[PDB]
Design a protein around this ligand. Structure first.
Ligand code: ATP
Ligand code: ATP
Ligand code: MG
Ligand code: MG
Ligand code: MG
Ligand code: MG
Lengths: 395, 395
């Protein structure tokens, strides 16, 4: 009894004591056997949602309508779900029927309270071989829920299994069925897929299967998805870093409409574009300017250098370290640190408030950051006063 | 900082550090002030669902569509919700706007990370006075969401506050609007209502307001709901015990269609009926038979005696204790313990399998339970053999 299951045992044990019968199901079982770090623990049972909610003190009703109830047990959330047959939903008492309806054999294993693997579909066998194979007829399953095809690919990215020959074939043959699946759902698969350790060969697969060109903005980018195999994807440590690089590798022109079409939240779309733009604007790591670094703020500069690294092969290590150093010597680090205020500039220049003020303050921060003048009132004043009779001597 | 809020502080503190601003809202603030045991802590914030989900490691998406996200923090689930204006939903940045849309002034208080009470609608006053008053126009609020009326009454039951004269008036004037609210939602209110410490006066209230007779099966039971005031409701310790007694007190004829019309889950409807039935079959605590006790199993017998107690005024103490004792001396406690098997009876009586076998086994368990014969094979055999030549001497 490995620690992730050890603590979830309470749940099974209690469902059993009320005469129910429950099992560990899902990736966690897969992971355990595969030797992976264990993902998160799910419990399937013969108990119906209102029974689960009656037995355990804290329960969250996530979706009891399709069998699932969240149980908070000794401090964590677990998803407990009644055994079901995938049509509205029908509940049963057969664990075997509940496994039959699961996507791939690896995912279709179960473990009992005593640690016994129950594996009626040869998932264990598929794990030894490292194969993603559909439970039952590859074709039928994908018709039932086209999204399964997407998962199959991401699983390739996540575990470096290979697609079974006939399962793969089914995908190309059943590609179209995707555009019936709501974007949101595809996005979370894509995101996982990009963060796969094997992302490097999952992107190409996205092309050699029919899946490309039913995914948003991946219309005929087949050439592009193949050359993607050369990108050092796994050093991307962040969501934005990922999307950014995806764009860069697909030669995406305007980041905004694309990342939007994927229904990613605004802040991510923005930040990804930010990185992307910075990267167009700084073509070499030495090229960073106090200005642009200040402008970008340490984090994003770092991400830029990481995304660059994932494209070049040059580890970001040394740059990240110089950026960290530079940033911490920037005479000011935010605009709010500026020792001088918009209203000061007004009193000094005898001009009424307006759009010239921004321009002033802008020229000032830059001058402070470039260290042309200290961040102190008296010295900016002189600086500004003297630079206003220079604009007179020029035109 | 009381312990319920102490641990939730983290959530606020983090939302604030990302520059958001969040408050403790809801019953828990009310509870705190009223001096009650604190119900469960909720957080309202200016941050949007996707921000909350971004900041906190474990999050459950219960309903981000209307602003709510559950955050698992240091081992508990908390409901975090973006400030909103009740129409689709509009998110704002005003805490004041978010409180304005809540049901009653007691429920519309707020507390900040430093323990400051923010109370723009005089909830604090309404607590001092012990009054349920609508936030804003009593009439308008009930039109917006008729369920509010139900809550007001259950809160009466839960806190012993009185309804404000004009709020009450609004209920009678706006009673009809209930039949637009789905039963399920009324059921959970009713259930709380029945388990109030003041249930004794909430049920009558249900009648003196127009609410009665838009609640299922409470058509013109006005007379009955008033006399309900005399029932010792607060000793009912269980859901079934409650419904049971509610039936008994409404003179409900057939338990089953009634409890069903309330959409309670089946096991409850069943068990309630069980208790109710046993109660019609045993009119005095002394009257319990080894038979009927064995037939009911300790739990239910106890529940019967408690439901009786709530109707009579005689404390169930002594009976509960004798039942516990009797049940633990029942020669067998389940039908499975019987020392003799259906197939034994066939071999013994030379008759083919069939419906007479049940009848035999039935007569046997009863005889064991009544202690007419030991629960042992050899002795049941004789008992049965000798009782089969008695049915010959009789007809
Ligand atoms: N689209 C689907 N069709 C059939 N079964 C599915 C589908 N999606 C999920 N499942 C089943 O339920 C589980 C889904 O859980 P989930 O997708 O969270 O984790 P997992 O696939 O097991 O691994 P991971 O934790 O990495 O995501 C799978 O184990 C599989 O049994
Ligand atoms: N129908 C409604 N109309 C307006 N506001 C509501 C409504 N239902 C709930 N609320 C608001 O949200 C909170 C709902 O919390 P909830 O019903 O869970 O607990 P509570 O009423 O505050 O007290 P308790 O924990 O005992 O139930 C209330 O405090 C109130 O602010
Ligand atoms: Mg999983
Ligand atoms: Mg978990
Ligand atoms: Mg509450
Ligand atoms: Mg809580």
């Amino acid at each position: 009894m490995k620690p992730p299951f050890q603590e979830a045992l309470g749940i099974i044990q209690q469902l059993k004591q009320h005469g129910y019968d429950a099992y560990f199901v899902g990736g966690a079982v897969r992971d355990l056997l595969l030797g992976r770090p264990i993902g998160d623990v799910d419990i399937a049972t013969s108990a119906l949602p209102e029974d689960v909610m009656a037995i355990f003190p804290k329960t969250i009703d996530v979706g009891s309508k399709h069998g699932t109830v969240v149980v908070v047990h000794k401090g964590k959330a677990y998803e407990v779900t009644t055994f079901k047959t995938d049509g509205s939903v029908t509940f049963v008492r057969s664990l075997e029927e509940d496994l039959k309806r699961r996507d791939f054999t690896m995912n279709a294993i179960a473990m009992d309270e005593y640690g016994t693997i129950i594996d009626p579909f040869g998932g264990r066998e598929a794990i030894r071989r490292r194969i993603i194979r559909t439970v039952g007829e590859a074709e039928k399953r994908f018709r039932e829920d086209a999204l399964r095809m997407m998962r199959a690919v991401r699983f390739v990215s996540e575990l470096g299994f290979a697609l079974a020959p006939d399962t793969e074939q089914a995908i190309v043959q059943n590609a179209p069925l995707l555009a019936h699946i709501s974007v949101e759902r595809m996005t979370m698969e894509m995101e996982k897929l990009l963060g796969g350790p094997f992302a490097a060969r999952a992107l190409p697969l996205l092309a050699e299967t029919g899946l490309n060109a039913y995914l948003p903005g991946l219309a005929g980018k087949e050439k592009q998805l193949r050359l993607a195999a050369a990108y050092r994807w796994p050093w991307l440590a962040a969501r934005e870093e990922r999307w950014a690089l995806l764009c860069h590798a697909l030669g995406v022109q305007e980041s905004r409409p694309f990342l939007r079409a994927w229904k990613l939240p605004n802040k991510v779309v923005d930040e990804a574009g930010a990185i992307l733009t910075a990267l167009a604007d700084i073509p070499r790591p030495e090229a960073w300017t106090n200005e642009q670094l200040f402008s970008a703020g340490l984090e994003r500069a770092l991400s830029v250098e990481t995304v660059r690294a994932a494209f070049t092969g040059a580890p970001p290590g040394p740059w990240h370290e110089k950026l960290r150093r530079r940033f911490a010597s920037l005479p000011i680090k935010t605009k709010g640190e500026l020792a001088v205020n918009g209203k000061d500039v007004i009193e000094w220049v005898g001009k009424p408030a307006g759009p010239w003020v921004k321009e002033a303050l802008d020229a000032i921060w830059r001058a402070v950051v470039n260290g042309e003048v200290e961040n102190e009132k008296e010295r900016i004043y002189a600086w500004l006063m003297e630079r206003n009779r220079t604009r007179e001597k020029n035109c």
